[PDB]
Amino acid sequence: GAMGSMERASLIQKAKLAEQAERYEDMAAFMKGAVEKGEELSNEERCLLSVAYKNVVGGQRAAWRVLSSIEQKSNEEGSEEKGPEVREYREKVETELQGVCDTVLGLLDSHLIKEAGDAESRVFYLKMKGDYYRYLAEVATGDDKKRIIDSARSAYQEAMDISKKEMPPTNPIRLGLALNFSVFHYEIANSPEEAISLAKTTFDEAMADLHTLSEDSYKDSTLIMQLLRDNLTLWT
Amino acid sequence: GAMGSMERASLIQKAKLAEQAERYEDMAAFMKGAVEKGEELSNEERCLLSVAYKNVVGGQRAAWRVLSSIEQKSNEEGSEEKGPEVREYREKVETELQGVCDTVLGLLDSHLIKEAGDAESRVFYLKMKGDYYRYLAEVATGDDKKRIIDSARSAYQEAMDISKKEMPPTNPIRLGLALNFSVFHYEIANSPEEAISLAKTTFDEAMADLHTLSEDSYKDSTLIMQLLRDNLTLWT
Amino acid sequence: FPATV
Amino acid sequence: FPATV
Numbered sequence: 193g194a195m196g197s198m199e200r201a202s203l204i205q206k207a208k209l210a211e212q213a214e215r216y217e218d219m220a221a222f223m224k225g226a227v228e229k230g231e232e233l234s235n236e237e238r239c240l241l242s243v244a245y246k247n248v249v250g251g252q253r254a255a256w257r258v259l260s261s262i263e264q265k266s267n268e269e270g271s272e273e274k275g276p277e278v279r280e281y282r283e284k285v286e287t288e289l290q291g292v293c294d295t296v297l298g299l300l301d302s303h304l305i306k307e308a309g310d311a312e313s314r315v316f317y318l319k320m321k322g323d324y325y326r327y328l329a330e331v332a333t334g335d336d337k338k339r340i341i342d343s344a345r346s347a348y349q350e351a352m353d354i355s356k357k358e359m360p361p362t363n364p365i366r367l368g369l370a371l372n373f374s375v376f377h378y379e380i381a382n383s384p385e386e387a388i389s390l391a392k393t394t395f396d397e398a399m400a401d402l403h404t405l406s407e408d409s410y411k412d413s414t415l416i417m418q419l420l421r422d423n424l425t426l427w428t
Numbered sequence: 429g430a431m432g433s434m435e436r437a438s439l440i441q442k443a444k445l446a447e448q449a450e451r452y453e454d455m456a457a458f459m460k461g462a463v464e465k466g467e468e469l470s471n472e473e474r475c476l477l478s479v480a481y482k483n484v485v486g487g488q489r490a491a492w493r494v495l496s497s498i499e500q501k502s503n504e505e506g507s508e509e510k511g512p513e514v515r516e517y518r519e520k521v522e523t524e525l526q527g528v529c530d531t532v533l534g535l536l537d538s539h540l541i542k543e544a545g546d547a548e549s550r551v552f553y554l555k556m557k558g559d560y561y562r563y564l565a566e567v568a569t570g571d572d573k574k575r576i577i578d579s580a581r582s583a584y585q586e587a588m589d590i591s592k593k594e595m596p597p598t599n600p601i602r603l604g605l606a607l608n609f610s611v612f613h614y615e616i617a618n619s620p621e622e623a624i625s626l627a628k629t630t631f632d633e634a635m636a637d638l639h640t641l642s643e644d645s646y647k648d649s650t651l652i653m654q655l656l657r658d659n660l661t662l663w664t
Numbered sequence: 665f666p667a668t669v
Numbered sequence: 670f671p672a673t674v
């Protein structure tokens with residue numbers, strides 16, 4: 193790895209600089225190098241990892257959706273044949289996206305998840321595993337598409353089971369997991385009723401636990417509760 | 429070149445798709461491949477080339493300025509020694525920026541400028557040459573810094589001389605050249621009075637030529653005149 | 665698109 | 670920063 197010669201602390205320092213500069217590809221490369229040092233990640237370092245790759249793959253997904261829409265329009269009735277270029281370029285972006293997802297899933301599998309014993313780290317990594325299988329599912333069309341969807345579901349479900357046992361209902365990681373698993377149900381698994389039920393039950397159980405929280409924890413939890421509410425409003 | 433096997437028209441088609449997807453690194457790579465086919469560029473293709481690299485290097489400059497500011501703060505009185513990481517990462521971004529500028533200047537030199545005979549193409553390419561030497565000048569600190577600045581000045585000056593002889597004062601390329609050469613005077617050459625004089629004289633001469641224009645040409649010209657006015661307001 | 669974090 | 674095109 194090109195980061196093998198850099199100190200772990202220097203990689204973390206530069207990941208933070210890259211975030212300040214909005215250089216998310218650099219940020220992800222630095223955090224990949226930090227993970228490959230083999231030591232477990234702190235809470236803050238897990239956030240740096242997640243932010244970096246979320247921004248990289250988010251840009252790729254946005255581009256893929258633009259190109260897929262152009263491609264679909266080109267194959268509708270009355271469109272003029274434009275050649276293979278749209279499909280080729282959509283495939284190029286799709287392959288790069290899949291490459292990033294495979295890289296993240298590889299970091300989780302070698303060996304972040306197996307060494308994560310605390311609820312806060314294990315649920316965080318399993319949520320990430322569900323997320324990046326979800327991104328693979330968004331572009332999947334072949335023989336393994338159902339297996340990709342089930343890999344996302346399985347990771348989310350293990351994370352949910354741990355989070356319900358080991359975390360309070362206002363924990364922001366538990367909330368963000370439920371938010372994303374709900375989106376998985378709605379957008380990937382064709383289960384809008386499950387998506388809505390999960391978002392509503394998550395919101396209501398967090399609401400009833402807010403009274404236990406400090407002002408700063410309250411702000412963190414209500415932020416993600418509002419995202420649950422936004423989705424419910426979009427879906428109902 | 430990795431684009432040597434793709435059709436020129438396919439590269440142009442994909443550059444336009446990349447712009448729609450806001451994938452400006454791809455857009456620049458496609459347009460670099462198109463230039464390297466060896467044929468002259470159309471007006472529209474020159475715009476695609478300029479837009480692609482303007483967006484790539486613009487992001488690099490923005491990042492370099494963030495990192496340079498952090499670096500300067502770290503070397504002020506009372507700051508805690510943080511090690512070489514800030515300088516290293518600023519240098520990494522700076523080297524990548526210089527690489528992009530050298531690539532663009534290489535396309536202009538081999539062989540866009542020497543084959544550009546019409547005023548609209550020659551002035552466009554010479555403006556670009558001034559621009560990318562200006563970006564090199566923004567980060568320059570060594571023995572050749574004055575020569576980099578003079579390379580920018582020389583390219584801008586040849587473009588100005590042709591534009592004043594061969595283009596009406598409302599021509600958007602003439603206007604954009606004058607805008608950027610004015611910024612060169614203000615920000616690079618430490619000549620704010622020349623910057624202001626050039627922006628004002630350019631604005632006034634275009635104002636007096638607006639009456640000759642159609643509605644659509646009027647919109648194009650007044651758009652860049654407003655940028656001249658914005659700079660004058662910033663500078664006075 | 666719906667919100668995810 | 671000043672405007673350039």
Ligand SMILES: *SCCN(C)[C@H](O)C(C)(C)Oc1ccc(Cl)cc1
Nearest residue numbers: 238239242243319364365368369669
């Ligand atoms: S862990 C990245 C930083 N967090 C605190 C985010 O910026 C926000 C969106 C505010 O919060 C969460 C992100 C992810 C998760 Cl799993 C939970 C909360």
Ligand SMILES: *SCCN(C)[C@H](O)C(C)(C)Oc1ccc(Cl)cc1
Nearest residue numbers: 474475478479555600601604605674
């Ligand atoms: S050539 C790229 C497209 N042009 C038309 C630009 O979008 C704007 C900024 C509107 O106009 C100009 C760009 C460059 C130049 Cl040299 C002149 C006008």
Ligand SMILES: [Mg+2]
Nearest residue numbers: 198199200201
């Ligand atoms: Mg070490």
Ligand SMILES: [Mg+2]
Nearest residue numbers: 283286287331
């Ligand atoms: Mg594919």
Ligand SMILES: [Mg+2]
Nearest residue numbers: 386389390393
């Ligand atoms: Mg249930």
Ligand SMILES: [Mg+2]
Nearest residue numbers: 434435436437
């Ligand atoms: Mg050919």
Ligand SMILES: [Mg+2]
Nearest residue numbers: 519522523567
């Ligand atoms: Mg340097």
Ligand SMILES: [Mg+2]
Nearest residue numbers: 622625626629
């Ligand atoms: Mg003069």
